[model samples]
Target: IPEYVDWRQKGAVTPVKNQGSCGSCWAFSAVVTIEGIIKIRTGNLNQYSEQELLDCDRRSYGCNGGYPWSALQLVAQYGIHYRNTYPYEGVQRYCRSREKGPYAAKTDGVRQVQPYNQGALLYSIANQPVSVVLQAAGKDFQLYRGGIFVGPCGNKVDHAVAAVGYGPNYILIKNSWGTGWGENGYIRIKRGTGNSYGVCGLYTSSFYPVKN
Candidate 1:
């Protein structure tokens, strides 16, 4: 395996974004993964509608919390619109009718990374950004400004993020909290650890979009 990989430098990542006080991190995580995969395949980087998922995805609680898995399934089933067409409003409202909005992109399937294995997580992300859940309620995580976070964190699994790349002993994850936080909306957590949950329980749950 390569010693390091950074998708941002490789042009596969979109600009970092913010989700505000809402619990729509799942939408941000899932959308960015889809965007990266689309860009990787088509060379056209376009942002998708997180609000489409937040409002239309009945399987999840809009702005309350959601699963990246369900969001991916939603995209595969109904496809997603461009962000400009359905723009994010943070709070939940009603699902807009899809009669006029042609989908900007859609995936045929999604794959879950086998749980609790850093090697598997690495392999998955090596192909594209992967959506992951972890404990972000801790002060150490919430206030994290920089560095390879070895953590004073735990495994509550309350937040979602996108793992964009990694290096030996560390993984680079993108956040939905905007560039003001955590290395311009990114965090590097300890990787290759022996624990089942990796640094912040990031290894516990993960999923990625599949275009082929």
Candidate 2:
């Protein structure tokens, strides 16, 4: 177990968009991770292109969705491409090629860091950056209206987003439900309790400063 079991309480909140009604959870996670790293590393919260990950990466699970570990594996193997070059299509569409201007990274693999524990997951934001996580079976999440949320969304995981930062007593999260809902499109979950937003502490992964 991590030293702290509830880092979500101490992280900052980020406004994120949901890839609603699509099985683009994998792409959401990949781009969410980059978005946080870019913000922390460069002080810019520019949204990256999930479409690039959807179209280029063969290892990703696609609309069928996938786990954070698998998404990290794809990043390690193929290296993520730039958002400007690839650009996002908003919703799911036909896949595209890397030669279309968005170039993929030239790396063989990424260092496989340990999966995040509650304490480490929270501490990670302070030391480095955090990645996006995906969940399954959390359809009721559509009803999340803001404030501290905890859940199984009726007891099941079913969506995806990024853990951008933390607050004093809340875990700031980025959702994919568009900017039309929630806290301008975000949710804050209680750090230590599992109420209506499912288990966020259990879904986390990291990226290397350089591709391994």
Candidate 3:
């Protein structure tokens, strides 16, 4: 295993975004993973639209929280537009495109990282950013500013974020709470802490897109 892998340094990851007060993080998480993979494959980093997913992806509830797994499937089926075109309003809106041409990115398929397996998760992040769900309901997470998050966290898997990289004992996650949160919209959760799920159930519900 590599000692460290940061996709941000590789130009695969995009700048952090704010989800506002909306429970639209599922869209952000899915978009970030797709954006990273598309960048890795094409050498172009396009900020795909979470608003498109929030409105277009019926598989997930818009702004009321959702799952990245189904969101990934939505992108695979109907591709997605860029942020410049679709834009994010952080609220439920009508699906803008029924026949828009030239999507920003397309997913050939979606793959799930094995649950409770940090090595498998690490292996996936080594290639491209991956979307993972975790509990972020406590003050520790909501108020987190920096440091490796050895959380007083839960296992409910309430929020979605992208695991962009990993170091010796930490998984670097990019959050959708904007650059003011954590280490500039990123968090380093403690890894291999004897829990199979890592910190905050970080090893659970991990997934990514496969590009054609």
Candidate 4:
């Protein structure tokens, strides 16, 4: 660890979904970057269903706003359920029917990482995880208590996040407004700034998730 490289300490990434007060945070950063692409395609850490795309992705906007490539086309049109079977009621309701049996995760497509291109946005989180979008409630990113974040934040992204790597400087974002924000929740930007769209533009709406 010549400086850092924390995809949740090699497990990929998880735990951080607070999106409270609604706004569906692009369906909790596309269900936490599709639960790290179904735990790197099958280790299955398990934790899906951002309230099943926040009350059935009618093309994003359940509590207010959304759009991680339109919730990965509604998670490839109906195919998701977990988080203890459609849990997390931060707000917004209705829509849920994949029957009451089982359904954990599924994905076939999702791509978008265009803008400035700081080495293809840190080469897609150095491998996995990347559903970012930030402005992250400014005030120096809402009382951040860490090292790298260094920003007054511009390019105003609004919310949504999950990066998980690119060290030797920083770029480990993984937050959904819990663990009391920052360090605990996660946030350590300010990395290698080849200055594409990072820092606060957070790679200008990056994207990921593609398994099946």
What is the TM-score of candidate 3?
0.97
Q: What are the per-residue Cα lDDT tens digits for candidate 4 across 1-212?
A: 33445667767676776888888888888887888778887876778878778788887788898787788777766568878877888887788645656566668888888776766767777678788887876788888987788697887788887787767777888777788877888888886666676778877878887786
- Give the lDDT of residue 176 in candidate 2: 68
Regarding TM-score, does 2 or 3 come out ahead? 3
lDDT of 2 by residue, 104-194 (tens): 4433333433554455456664543345453434544557777776655432344555565666556666666678767777666656553
Provide the overall lDDT of each model, using Cα atoms, as 2-decimal numbers: 0.90, 0.54, 0.90, 0.77
Model 3, 1-212: lDDT tens per residue? 57999998899888899999999999999999988988898899889999989998887889898889888998888789989888889889888866556777779889999899988999999988999999999899999989999989978789999999999989999999999999999999999888997788888799899888
The lDDT ranking, best first, is 1, 3, 4, 2
- Which ranges in model 1 have alpha carbons more than 4 Å from their true place? 97-100
In terms of lDDT, model 4 sits at 0.77
TM-score of each: 0.97, 0.69, 0.97, 0.35
Model 1, 50-90: lDDT tens per residue? 99999988999998898899999999987999888898898
The alpha-carbon lDDT assigned to residue 125 of candidate 1 equals: 86
Q: In lDDT terms, how accurate is model 2? A: 0.54
